């Protein structure tokens, strides 16, 4: 909440689902990209944003994997 | 006459050279000159030694490279 998650019981449940279990990659859908910033406040400097449409996608993710970078991929539709 | 390969110099075969001269055993040399590196690369791998290398000794189907395997051979050829 302190980052800026919404008070809603729905949105708390959702966040709990995303965080609590990570044996699998979570897919976030939100029209208002207020959630993209929530996870950014949680992981801070380590937060690296990419998108499956961008040019250097190919390489930048290889750099993200190698050094423990917490990654959010901006266009999940395109994969 | 057995065949000893090394640079035209004392290098890693010197002791062996002495031993040979000690046992008054005759031999012939494959000598690498100062700027003769080609000549080496020319024979380097087509010699059929157990490990190609320098120096090398070759006699009665005794192919030796590794200064130790070589020296021991000369030594053994005189029961030593």
């Amino acid at each position: 909440l302190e980052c800026g998650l919404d008070k809603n019981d729905y949105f708390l449940e959702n966040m709990s689902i995303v965080m609590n279990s990570q044996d699998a990659v979570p897919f976030l859908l939100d029209p208002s990209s207020h959630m993209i910033t929530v996870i950014s406040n949680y992981y801070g400097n380590k937060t690296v944003l990419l998108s499956f449409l961008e040019e250097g996608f190919v390489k930048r993710l290889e750099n993200a994997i190698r050094f423990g970078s917490v990654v959010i991929i901006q266009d999940g539709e395109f994969f | 006459s057995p065949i000893l390969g090394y640079w035209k110099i004392k290098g890693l075969v010197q002791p062996t050279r002495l031993l040979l001269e000690y046992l008054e055993e005759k031999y012939e040399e494959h000598l690498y000159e100062r700027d003769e590196g080609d000549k080496w690369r020319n024979k380097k791998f087509e010699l059929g030694l157990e490990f190609p290398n320098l120096p090398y000794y070759i006699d009665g189907d005794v192919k030796l490279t590794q200064s130790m395997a070589i020296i021991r051979y000369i030594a053994d050829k005189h029961n030593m």
């Binding site: 400097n45 250097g56 930048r60 750099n63 993200a64 050094f67 | 157990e50 490990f51 590794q66 395997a69």
Partner: protein, 313 residues
């Protein structure tokens, strides 16, 4: 010992030759000169390993179907060279096997997992290679690929109709620099790069300065090439613009010496170490852009005199 005098002496000869390799490693491992020596070692290594790959054709272990002593010698060597290089085996599957085979022997495998096993270091703790308390991991391996690429940097150079020599095909190095720079930024996210941290900061400052001169240099190269079409060839054009051609040729001298000094270096990275390069190019591009801008004002003032010229272009 083996089957017979011959096979027993053969097993001893293997002992010897294996040590001539295991030892070769440790003699350049205490040296401060390690980081650059490995290159020439790993290149020779193949020829030595090869002999063993052959021996291992139609044999289950070195020297036959039963495990022999030389197999345990080569295994020590192997075990040690794989820590230095993880891909020492990759090019020789028959050895990758021999290695796993040893590790597979129930007794051995049970041992490596036991309390009796001393797992690491490889060489006396003082040694440069494989010493110290705990093995580091990838950060160095990647930084080495970055440094390697930059002490090979090669630019298509082609001299055109007149004096100066041109740098063609910008993109490849253009891209590489920016990518390898983004790589160092992501290295800050890693846990164990704090003290190894400092060196990378030096290589980061070296490449961030290479992109500083990369940005301006492509601009210079483009805007000179463009202006050469316009003023470099005719007498009529330079007749109308005298202050412009007298100032173009003065820059043409400087950049001709700047390129030929930078080309003969043979290392594009080495260019950041050259005296007054970012300052020289920033001066050159400024003046080249003042000429382009002067021509622009001349052509439009020509067009306003006879407003048909607006139609022409």
């Amino acid at each position: 010992l083996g089957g017979c005098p011959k096979e027993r002496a053969e097993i001893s000869m293997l002992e010897g030759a294996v040590l001539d390799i295991r030892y070769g490693v440790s003699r350049i491992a205490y040296s401060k000169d390690f980081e650059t020596l490995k290159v020439d070692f790993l290149s020779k290594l193949p020829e030595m390993l090869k002999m063993f790959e052959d021996r291992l054709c139609h044999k289950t272990y070195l020297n036959g179907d039963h495990v022999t002593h030389p197999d345990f010698m080569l295994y020590d060597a192997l075990d040690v060279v794989l820590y230095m290089d993880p891909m020492c085996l990759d090019a020789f599957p028959k050895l990758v096997c021999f290695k796993k085979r040893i590790e597979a022997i129930p007794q051995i495998d049970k041992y490596l997992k036991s309390s009796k096993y001393i797992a690491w270091p490889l060489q006396g703790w003082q040694a440069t290679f494989g010493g110290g308390d705990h093995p580091p991991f990838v950060i160095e391996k990647s930084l080495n690929r970055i440094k390697k690429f930059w002490k090979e940097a090669q630019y298509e150079v082609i001299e055109h109709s007149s004096g100066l020599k041109l740098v063609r095909e910008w993109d490849v190095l253009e891209q590489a620099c920016k990518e390898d720079l983004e790589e160092l930024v992501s290295m800050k996210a890693s846990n164990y790069y704090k003290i190894f941290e400092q060196d990378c900061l030096d290589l980061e400052s070296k490449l961030t300065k290479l992109s500083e001169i990369q940005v301006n240099w492509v601009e210079v190269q483009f805007y000179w090439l463009d202006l050469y079409g316009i003023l470099g060839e005719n007498l009529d054009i330079q007749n109308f613009l005298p202050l412009e051609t007298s100032k173009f040729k003065s820059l043409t001298s400087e950049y001709k010496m700047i390129t030929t000094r930078a080309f003969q270096l043979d290392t594009t990275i080495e260019v950041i170490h050259i005296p007054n390069f970012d300052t020289t190019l920033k001066l050159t591009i400024d003046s080249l852009k003042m000429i382009k801008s002067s021509l622009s004002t001349f052509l439009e003032r020509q067009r306003r005199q006879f407003p048909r010229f607006y139609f022409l272009g």
